[PDB]
Amino acid sequence: XDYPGDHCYLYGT
Amino acid sequence: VANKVCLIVIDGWGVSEDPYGNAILNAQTPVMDKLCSGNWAQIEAHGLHVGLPEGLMGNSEVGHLNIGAGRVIYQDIVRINLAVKNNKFVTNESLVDACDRAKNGNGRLHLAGLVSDGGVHSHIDHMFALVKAIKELGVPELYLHFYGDGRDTSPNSGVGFLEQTLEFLEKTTGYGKLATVVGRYYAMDRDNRWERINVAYEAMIGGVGETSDEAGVVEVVRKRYAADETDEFLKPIILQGEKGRVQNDDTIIFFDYRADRMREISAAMGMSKLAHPSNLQVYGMTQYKAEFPFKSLFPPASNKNVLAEWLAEQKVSQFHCAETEKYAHVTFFFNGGLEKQFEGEERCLVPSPKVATYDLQPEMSAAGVADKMIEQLEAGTHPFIMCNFAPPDMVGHTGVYEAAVKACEATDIAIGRIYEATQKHGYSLMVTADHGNAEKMKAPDGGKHTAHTCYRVPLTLSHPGFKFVDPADRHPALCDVAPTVLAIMGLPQPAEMTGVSIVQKI
Ligand code: NA
Ligand code: NA
Ligand SMILES: [Zn+2]
Ligand SMILES: [Zn+2]
């Protein structure tokens, strides 16, 4: 969530 | 503005002709049955089309980011893999900077990170690519600090990655030296257990650990395995002696792309009874903390002139509306993955119902979102308005098929109400989605399917003055929505939006 394209964007919600 | 535009982003509504467990097809959806006919498009919302790894389903955060941005934002893994494939490390601005610092300084550079093919925090292939490029850039002296995995890979796979590394350095590059092996339990703590970090820190700076060399280090690890000490928990092994320590004036690159487990060790280097080396410069593969002074090999996409910013720059006001569960999606993510609100941008939060699970109230607050959008259409103040409809995704995630049917019915009703108001008040309607979900509620087994999908999503347009076209070189995708909106509105497209408009004016 800290920058566009970091690891949280791989799964999201 | 030539045409005012209302953009509906349905959450979790994909295009599937497969009718089994398809809550959209089986729901009464007479409005979308009509809007998704004639002049409409079907656009991609998963995988490389939205900057994710091939074959990966889309999601709400990626989807709204790409819709709002009018370009593909490449997720870290894809972005770095492309740089490796296309031999772009050797011209990477920050890598050249790190290598120039070593060459103009004491000649010494360090690489440190998780050495496996797990791909969660790092990949060994990236480290290999870095060594090859650093060699080509002429750095005099290069040391590797190997963090053992055993968590994203099996607990006794580390000796295989250690063999690969030794062979690579000796026979493929003939350049670079392994200096430290230590388990990720120590090097990659994220719980402020600095007694763990200190083990890795003293190994790197002071050589505190078991002495070995290239001929013996695999056997050291095999003895650890036999003592039931596996990769994640490897106590430090020290190679090359003092030469291989992080010393005064040295340069260090951490090659992990996942920030959370790099923050502690990178901060310890860049900012115990051992003397701390002075005048280090630290680089991360990616940004680990905006507050750090570290350069990044792959810094965050600047994402200048996303749609919300661009409209404000053109002095056009705008409206963003969602219910509670998707409010961040139409603000933080739609606006580029940061908390910034632009001049003239009005926001509207509709409360989600207070229920234990959303299959208990599958219409959620779609009617309230429609009410607020209709109000804006009647006023006509904002030339661009957009909303999100939460039910298909949020009820989809419960896995309850009949609830998902009702979610899609409620969403279709709401869309029709907005559509009728756009026709009365002179707006063009475009309906899209951020990824699929509710079109696939059952696995082939008959069991629940609670996840997103890789199906395409709709893109509709009520304005009869435009025809949908395809890009020359690829499927249409979410990155083309904002360009298409701007064309319909008669507004300019910023150069930073490298997506394309997929309409032609007749
Ligand atoms: Na239907
Ligand atoms: Na699903
Ligand atoms: Zn979802
Ligand atoms: Zn979504």
Numbering used by the authors:
A (entry chain C): 1 to 13
B (entry chain A): 27 to 297, 305 to 539
Sentences reproduced from the published study:
To gain structural insight into the molecular interactions of the C-terminus of ipglycermides with iPGM, we established co-crystal structures using analogs, Ce-2 Tyr7Phe and Ce-1 Cys14NHOH (Ce-1 NHOH), respectively, retaining Cys14 or replacing it with NHOH, an oxidation-insensitive and solid-phase peptide synthesis (SPPS)-accessible metal-ion–coordinating ligand. Using our established crystallization conditions, supplemented with 2-mM tris(2-carboxyethyl)phosphine for Ce-2 Tyr7Phe–containing complexes, we were able to obtain crystals diffracting to 2.1 Å and 1.80 Å for Ce-2 Tyr7Phe and Ce-1 NHOH, respectively, bound to C. elegans iPGM. The electron density maps for these complexes were clearly defined, and all atoms for the ipglycermides could be modeled except for the Ce-1 NHOH solvent-exposed Tyr11 side chain. The “core” region of the peptide (Tyr1-Tyr11) forms hydrogen-bond interactions with N85, Q101, D102, and R289 like Ce-2d. However, residues 12 to 14 of Ce-2 Tyr7Phe and Ce-1 NHOH display nonoverlapping conformations resulting from differences in Zn2+ coordination. The C-terminal Thr13-hydroxamate residue side chain forms an interaction with E87, which appears to constrain this portion of the peptide and permits a bidentate interaction from the carbonyl (2.15 Å) and hydroxyl (2.30 Å) to a Zn2+. In addition, the Thr13 hydroxyl forms a hydrogen bond with the active site S86 that is coordinated to the second Zn2+. Notably, the sulfur atom of Cys14 is positioned in a nearly identical region as the Thr13/hydroxamate carbonyl in the iPGM⋅Ce-1 NHOH structure. Despite these conformational displacements, the Thr13 side-chain hydroxyl adopts a similar spatial position in both structures, thereby maintaining the hydrogen-bond interaction with the phosphatase domain E87 γ-carboxylate. Whereas the Ce-1 NHOH analog displays similar pan-ortholog inhibitory potency as Ce-1 and Ce-2, thus the Thr13-hydroxamic acid moiety acts as rather selective bio-isostere for the Cys14 thiolate of ipglycermide.
In all vertebrates, cofactor-dependent phosphoglycerate mutase (dPGM) is a 2, 3-bisphophoglycerate cofactor–utilizing homodimer consisting of 23-kDa subunits, while the parasitic enzyme is a 56-kDa monomer cofactor-independent enzyme consisting of a phosphatase domain connected by a flexible hinge to the phosphotransferase domain. In dPGM, an active site phosphohistidine (H10) equilibrates the phosphate between the 2 and 3 positions of glyceric acid, while in cofactor-independent phosphoglycerate mutase (iPGM), a transition metal ion–activated serine (S86) mediates the phosphate transfer. We previously discovered ipglycermide, a potent inhibitor of iPGM, from a large combinatorial cyclic peptide library. Our results show that the high-affinity binding of ipglycermide to iPGMs freezes these structurally dynamic enzymes into an inactive, stable complex.
